[PDB]
Ligand binder design. Structure first.
Ligand SMILES: O=c1ccn([C@@H]2O[C@H](COP(=O)(O)OP(=O)(O)O)[C@@H](O)[C@H]2O)c(=O)[nH]1
Ligand SMILES: OC[C@H]1O[C@H](O)[C@H](O)[C@@H](O)[C@@H]1O
Ligand SMILES: [Mn+2]
Length: 543
């Protein structure tokens, strides 16, 4: 399992009558050094392999027709394998912290109920539910602005809505234009207020705005802030405004951009979660994730052949919540579709258990490499709804830097476009023209995903966040690690590469009810059902 020594590499890369060139010798020296590093940190050894890798590339480029290159390229594969060896063999304890994030408003009971299942089965774990005490009204601001735009849009189309099958995309298109205008109005107000009185907090500005523009009662908004603050305080709340390292770092401006300007709480949470992991260590979880089910629990019950795996995984939790009642209002939509015999097998199994510890597994003493961040997987690949990292892991730093470099590219084209104070369509075109002029061979595909940034949260199937602060930033960091580099923009890693960094599937139950409804995005199917909902809501409005 050891990777090659100096002599073994000289045999490999041997070419009769060719002297060892300086750049060849350099690799050889560096390799022997690496084998003298028993007492060094894993990170120190990774950095050595990184330099060995860099010296190998130099040698290859310096002598492109060399009989050594075939073996040198082989040697590079060995370096990667060694990183995985290093990663898999030098494990340190994961700090016993569970980190949840809920920002922008009051947390609901169902989110708390999911959180308590984890608490209930991981008593040795300190729980953080990150919130922003300056920013409990962002969810209200977005809701009010979007509902206002919904109404203005219907009043624009009117009877044209009847006929024929009017293209519902026209609705969301016109509504985006109105949303962009209102949002710009607020952003302009926020910036004017901050520059007039830097002591003002987001919520002060938001409630004044809501009161001025939407005739909201600030007394009521005040009471909601009060209630939200109290509730999260009682539920392991941890204020972002006290997270000093995060506040003073280069990501905080990105966080606030998503929070205050774009109203994208999932993107804001993407930025927060990884800084929390870097700075504190532990395990990050989305509030719609539940503890792993005990593997032995349902073994005696065979999945019917007619039913898919993901369907079966949903019904397991639905079975649990039906008979054990751990979480109020939990759906049994799928469990109920089953044959009565299979339902009986579930209730007989669950009945033979008296404890929640017999139902959900505990996380226990986990360990992972100082090099890595482990990430959840689903049918579509990596997903950052579950993350595991020791404090200050090398990858956590790689991910933070990916996100920041991704936002730097975004904002370089976006800010000038927005500062021309034009409408949605003009702004969009200007921004895309700039994105296009700035794209090259190795970021092209990333750039194609940015063009859509301005509609995030407001138009169906706009998922740009994924490419900016979400899963693609992690894939890119992993490529950084295994490619011995920084700033990868073209992802070429395959599933098997990324599988190296996976969280064991048994540590998380992903197929939950709340996971089936995205809070920051919505698909075409959902867009259609919203649009018709809005049509009928409005018609019933004579009240
Ligand atoms: O109003 C909100 C909505 C979302 N989130 C955060 O965004 C995460 C991702 O939400 P969701 O699971 O809906 O995203 P998805 O898995 O559908 O991409 C949540 O767990 C929260 O951390 C938040 O803090 N406030
Ligand atoms: O990156 C956008 C989103 O991607 C994934 O769907 C994760 O579930 C979510 O937590 C994240 O916010
Ligand atoms: Mn989710």
């Amino acid at each position: 399992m050891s990777l090659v020594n100096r002599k073994q590499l000289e045999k490999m890369a041997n070419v009769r009558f060719r002297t060892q060139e300086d750049e060849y010798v350099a690799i050889l020296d560096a390799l022997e050094e690496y084998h003298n590093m028993s007492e060094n940190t894993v990170v120190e050894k990774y950095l050595k392999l990184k330099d060995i890798n860099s010296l190998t590339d130099i040698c290859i480029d310096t002598y492109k027709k060399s009989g050594r290159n075939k073996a040198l390229k082989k040697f590079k594969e060995y370096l990667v394998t060694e990183v995985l060896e290093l990663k898999n063999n030098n494990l340190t304890p994961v700090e016993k912290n569970l980190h949840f994030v809920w920002i922008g408003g009051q947390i609901n009971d169902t989110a708390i109920n999911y959180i308590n299942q984890w608490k209930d089965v991981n008593s040795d774990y300190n729980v953080n539910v990150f919130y922003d005490s300056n920013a409990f009204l962002i969810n209200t601001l977005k809701k009010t602005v979007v509902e206002s735009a919904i109404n203005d849009t219907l009043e624009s189309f009117r009877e044209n809505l009847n006929d024929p099958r009017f293209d519902y995309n026209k609705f969301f298109r016109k509504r985006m234009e109105i949303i962009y205008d209102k949002q710009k109005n607020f952003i302009n107000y926020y910036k004017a207020q901050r520059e007039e009185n830097p002591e003002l907090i987001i919520d002060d500005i938001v409630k004044t705005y809501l009161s001025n523009e939407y005739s909201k009662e600030i007394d009521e908004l005040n009471t909601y802030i009060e209630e939200s603050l109290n509730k999260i305080t009682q539920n392991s709340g941890n204020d972002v405004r006290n997270f000093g390292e995060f506040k003073n770092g280069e990501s905080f401006n990105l966080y606030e951009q998503e929070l205050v300007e774009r109203w994208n709480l999932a993107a804001a949470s993407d930025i927060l979660r990884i800084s929390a992991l870097k700075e504190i260590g532990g395990m990050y979880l989305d509030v719609d994730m539940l503890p792993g089910i005990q593997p032995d629990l349902f073994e005696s019950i065979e999945k019917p052949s007619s039913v898919t795996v993901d369907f079966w995984e949903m019904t397991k939790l639905e079975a649990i919540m039906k008979y054990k009642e751990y979480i109020p209002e939990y759906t049994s939509e799928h469990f109920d579709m089953l044959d009565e015999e299979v339902q009986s097998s579930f209730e007989s199994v669950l009945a033979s258990k008296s404890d929640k510890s017999e139902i959900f597994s505990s996380l226990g003493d986990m360990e992972a490499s100082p090099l890595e961040v482990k990430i959840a997987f689903n049918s579509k690949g990596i997903i950052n709804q579950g993350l595991i990292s020791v404090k200050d892991s090398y990858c956590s730093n790689l991910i933070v830097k990916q996100i920041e470099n991704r936002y730097k590219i975004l904002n370089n084209s976006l800010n000038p476009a927005i500062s021309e104070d034009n409408d949605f369509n003009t702004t969009t075109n200007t921004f895309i023209d700039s994105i296009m002029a700035e794209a090259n061979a190795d970021n092209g595909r990333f750039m194609m995903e940015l063009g859509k940034y301005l509609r995030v949260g407001f138009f169906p199937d706009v998922k740009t966040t994924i490419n900016l602060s979400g899963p693609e930033a992690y894939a890119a960091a992993y490529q950084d690690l295994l490619m011995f580099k920084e700033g990868s923009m073209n992802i070429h890693l395959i599933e098997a590469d990324l599988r190296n960094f996976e969280i064991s599937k048994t540590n998380i139950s992903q197929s939950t009810e709340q996971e089936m409804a995205s809070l920051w995005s919505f698909d075409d199917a959902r867009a259609k059902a919203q649009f018709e909902e809005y049509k009928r809501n409005y018609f019933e409005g004579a009240l």
